C-alpha cells in the first residue's frame, strides 16, 4: 500500500490550507523540514529563522518545492533535458510524449514544451497525477537562502566561529550538494570577514543558516507542487556539448545555464561569448548555443493590442483572459513587473492586469 514518506530535509513553501500570515516570510518563501513530530505534524525552520509546527494531514500547510535534499529518487529514470540519472526528488513525466521525463529543476525551469501537460510523480509509490500545462499555470519566485542571500548562522550551526562570530554576516554564492545522494542541500558562503565554507541548508533537515536578506531562487509552478503529507539556452545538451568543442567546452558547473538566464559580460578574441550568471560564474559559448529575447523593462509604457480576436487568443493561450479586460483594448499603460513566465503586470485604466507580452507594444 501507499504510505507517507517522512522526508526530513525537504524544501517547502506555504500550502493550500495556510492561515498563518507571514510566518514563512511571505508566499514563495522557502523553509526546511526539520523533523516530524507525528504523521500529522511537521516542524519547519524557515529560511528567515522562524521555527514552527504545521499540519500535514487533512489540513495541509505546506507544499514541497524540492524533495531532492531528502535523497528520495526514482531508480530506472533519467531527466531527458539535464540527464540526471536517477531523477532525484519529484519525478515529472510528460503525458503528451513517449517516454519523456524531467527533474524538478528542468520542470520548474521551463524545459521541454510548456504546452505539454505533465504527470507529477512525487514518490516511487505515487500514482501519477495529470496537471495543467505550465503555459497556463501560475508561476511565482522562490525566496530565501539562494545565491546572493545575506545570511547569519542558523539554529543547527556547529562550526565554531567560522563566520567570525554569532551574528556576523556573509553572502551565499551558490546552492550546492552536501553529498552526491543529497543535492541542492547546501549553501556555499563567503563570510564578510573573508572566511568561507559550505553549510547545510536542508541536508538531514539541518538549518546552518538564516538569511537576514533573502534572495530569489528561481521560479516555480506553485499549484503543481505536491502538498506535504540576457541569454537562455533552449537546446538539447548533446547539441550544446558538441557545439562547445573549441568554444570553452562543457563542465558540470554549467548546468545552471540550461534553466537560468545569464548575461553577456563579454565577447572574446575567437568571437565566442562570455556569459555571467547570478551564481557569480562566467562561462564561454559558441554563439550558436545562445538565444536571446525578453524585450520589455519595468516602467516601459505599452499599448494594449486592440485586435480582440488576437488578444483573446494571446490571453487564453497563457491562461490570463477575462472579459473584464475589454476596456483595456488599445489603452496605454505601464509595465509594473515582468513575471518569471514572461507575462507582464501592466497598470492600465487605474487597475493592473496580467498580459501575454505579445498582447502589448512599446509606445
Beta carbon nearer to Zn ion, 32 or 84 = 84
Q: To the nearest whole angstrom, how small is the minimum distance from the Cβ of residue 100 to Zn ion?
A: 5
Q: To the nearest whole angstrom, how small is the minimum distance from the Cβ of residue 236 to Zn ion?
A: 12
**CA torsion 56→57→63→66, rounded to 10°?**
70
Asked if residue 79 belongs to a known ligand binding site, the reply is yes
- Pairing, β 41-46 against β 51-57: antiparallel
Q: To the nearest whole angstrom, how small is the minimum distance from the Cβ of residue 112 to Zn ion?
A: 6
Asked if residue 74 belongs to a known ligand binding site, the reply is no
Q: To the nearest whole angstrom, how small is the minimum distance from the Cβ of residue 175 to Zn ion?
A: 15
Asked if residue 82 belongs to a known ligand binding site, the reply is yes
Angle, alpha carbons 79-84-90 (nearest 5°): 65
- Pairing, β 87-88 against β 73-74: antiparallel
Beta carbon nearer to Zn ion, 171 or 184 = 184
Asked if residue 305 belongs to a known ligand binding site, the reply is no
Beta carbon nearer to Zn ion, 90 or 325 = 90
Beta carbon nearer to Zn ion, 103 or 311 = 103
Asked if residue 211 belongs to a known ligand binding site, the reply is no
**Contact (Cβ atoms closer than 8 angstroms) between residue 29 and residue 16:** no
Q: To the nearest whole angstrom, how small is the minimum distance from the Cβ of residue 252 to Zn ion?
A: 13
Contact set with Zn ion (CB under 5 A): 79, 81-82, 84, 94, 96-97, 103, 106, 116
**Contact (Cβ atoms closer than 8 angstroms) between residue 102 and residue 95:** no
Asked if residue 265 belongs to a known ligand binding site, the reply is no
Beta carbon nearer to Zn ion, 68 or 359 = 68
Beta carbon nearer to Zn ion, 60 or 250 = 250
Beta carbon nearer to Zn ion, 98 or 158 = 98
Q: To the nearest whole angstrom, how small is the minimum distance from the Cβ of residue 257 to Zn ion?
A: 13
Q: To the nearest whole angstrom, how small is the minimum distance from the Cβ of residue 103 to Zn ion?
A: 3
Q: Annotated binding site: which residue ranges?
A: 79, 82, 94, 97, 103, 106, 112, 116
Q: Annotated binding site for Zn(2+): which residue ranges?
A: 79, 82, 94, 97, 103, 106, 112, 116
Amino acid at each position: 500500500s501507499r504510505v507517507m514518506v517522512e522526508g526530513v530535509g525537504a524544501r517547502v513553501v506555504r500550502g493550500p490550507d495556510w492561515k498563518w500570515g507571514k510566518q514563512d516570510g511571505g508566499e514563495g518563501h522557502v523553509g526546511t523540514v526539520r523533523s516530524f513530530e507525528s504523521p500529522e505534524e511537521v516542524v519547519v525552520v524557515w529560511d528567515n529563522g522562524t521555527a514552527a509546527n504545521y499540519r500535514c494531514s487533512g489540513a495541509y500547510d505546506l507544499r514541497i518545492l524540492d524533495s531532492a535534499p531528502t535523497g528520495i529518487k526514482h531508480d530506472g529514470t533519467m531527466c531527458d533535458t539535464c540527464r540526471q540519472q536517477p531523477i532525484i526528488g519529484i519525478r515529472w513525466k510528460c503525458a503528451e510524449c513517449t517516454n519523456y521525463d524531467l527533474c524538478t529543476v528542468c520542470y520548474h525551469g521551463d524545459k521541454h514544451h510548456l504546452r505539454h501537460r505533465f504527470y507529477r510523480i512525487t514518490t516511487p509509490g505515487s500514482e501519477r497525477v495529470l496537471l495543467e500545462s505550465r503555459r497556463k499555470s501560475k508561476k511565482i519566485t522562490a525566496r530565501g537562502i539562494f545565491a546572493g542571500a545575506r545570511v547569519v548562522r542558523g539554529v543547527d550551526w556547529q562550526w565554531e566561529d567560522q563566520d567570525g562570530g554569532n551574528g556576523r554576516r556573509g553572502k551565499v554564492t551558490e546552492i550546492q550538494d552536501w553529498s552526491a545522494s543529497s543535492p541542492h542541500s547546501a549553501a556555499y558562503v563567503l563570510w564578510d570577514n573573508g572566511a568561507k565554507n559550505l553549510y547545510r541548508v536542508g541536508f538531514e533537515g539541518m538549518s546552518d543558516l538564516k538569511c537576514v536578506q533573502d534572495a530569489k531562487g528561481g521560479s516555480f509552478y506553485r499549484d503543481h507542487c505536491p502538498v506535504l503529507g540576457l541569454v537562455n539556452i533552449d537546446l538539447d545538451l548533446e547539441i550544446v556539448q558538441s557545439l562547445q568543442h573549441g568554444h570553452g567546452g562543457w563542465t558540470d558547473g554549467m548546468f545552471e545555464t540550461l534553466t537560468t538566464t545569464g548575461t553577456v559580460c563579454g565577447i572574446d578574441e575567437d568571437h565566442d561569448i562570455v556569459v555571467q550568471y547570478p551564481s557569480g560564474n562566467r562561462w564561454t559559448f559558441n554563439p550558436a548555443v545562445l538565444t536571446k529575447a525578453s524585450q520589455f523593462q519595468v516602467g516601459d509604457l505599452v499599448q494594449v493590442c486592440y485586435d480582440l480576436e488576437r488578444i483573446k487568443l494571446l490571453q487564453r493561450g497563457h491562461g490570463e483572459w477575462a472579459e473584464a479586460m475589454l476596456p483595456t483594448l488599445g489603452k496605454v499603460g505601464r509595465v509594473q513587473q515582468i513575471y518569471s513566465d514572461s507575462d507582464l503586470k501592466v497598470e492600465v485604466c487605474g487597475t493592473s492586469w496580467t498580459y501575454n507580452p505579445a498582447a502589448v507594444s512599446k509606445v
